[PDB]
Amino acid sequence: PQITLWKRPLVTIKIGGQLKEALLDTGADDTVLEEMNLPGRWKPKMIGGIGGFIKVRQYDQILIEICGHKAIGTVLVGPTPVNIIGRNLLTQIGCTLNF
Amino acid sequence: PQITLWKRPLVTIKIGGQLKEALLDTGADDTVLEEMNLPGRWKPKMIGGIGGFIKVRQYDQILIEICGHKAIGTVLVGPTPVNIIGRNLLTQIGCTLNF
Ligand SMILES: CC[C@@H](C)[C@H](NC(=O)OC)C(=O)N[C@@H](Cc1ccccc1)[C@@H](O)C[C@H](Cc1ccccc1)NC(=O)O[C@H]1CO[C@H]2OCC[C@H]21
């Protein structure tokens, strides 16, 4: 679809069999989700933002469905204030900015 | 134009007579620019992101040109690592996400 930006671009995602709400964020290199129990192995990682850096759990090759589009890639899990879908997954679903 | 998301979506902007590079960010409510001396009154504000909050100066009704498209709104100035164009100005140039 085409999504305007009057409101936050929030969409439903499905991950690890669970539904969640997440922000499509062209300003994020990576996808970061709030604390949650994801299956599989994970590695500690740090990611930085406008306020500073946080500690996260990096999960690899995780399946996510974003408004009916499937993506398989890296998902970071940690104390983020909002679930954000970053460019690593936005590119897999064919997302572009247009104006 | 159409902007892909393989790399950070950086574009040239013109503000206060100066040219700058900035990130088109659908995950940002507000526009935040790196420290610069803009004339006029301002109000203090705190903005949050991953990692915490930073203190910024809020300027009102500032004109910005974004790839030839003009927009007028609130611009925050402070110690951000990157110049960020947020939804308050992206809506004015008719920007959409498409997939
Ligand atoms: C000016 C921004 C604030 C106004 C705005 N918050 C807001 O609107 O709250 C109401 C805001 O922070 N939004 C971010 C998403 C977000 C996070 C928390 C709460 C709401 C929304 C995102 O859109 C922009 C940042 C910009 C950036 C890029 C590079 C280095 C430092 C900072 N990207 C980012 O943090 O990305 C992370 C995750 O992936 C990694 O790539 C880049 C860095 C890594």
Chain breaks in chain B (C to N over 2.5 A) after: none
* B36/A contact by beta carbon, under 8 A: no
Nearest to B41 by CA among B22, B60, B27, B66: B60
Q: Which residues contact A48 (CB under 8 A, 6 or more apart)?
A: A54, B50, B51, B81
Q: Which CATH class is domain B1-99?
A: mainly beta
Residues of B in contact with A91 (CB under 8 A): 4-6
Q: Which of A4, A54, A96 sits opposite B5 (nearest CB)?
A: A96
Query: Which ligand 1 atom sits closest to the C-alpha of B27?
Result: 23
Residue among A47, A92, A74, A23 nearest B26 (CA): A23
Cα B24 from Cα B17, distance rounded (Å): 20
Q: Please indicate whether, in this complex, the C-beta atoms of A3 and B98 are within 8 angstroms of each other.
A: yes
Give the Cα separation of B31 and B89 in Å (integer).
Answer: 7
Q: Where are the domains of chain A?
A: 1-99
Active site residue B25: yes
Pairing of strands A10-15, A53-66: antiparallel
Which residues are CB-contacts of B87 (< 8 A; sequence separation ≥ 6)?
A5, A6, A8, B26, B28, B29
Q: Which pair of structure tokens corresponds to residue B41?
A: 């009154």
A50 ligand 1 Cβ < 6 A: yes
Cβ-count burial A39-51 (b if 16+ within 10 Å, e if not): eeebeebebebbe
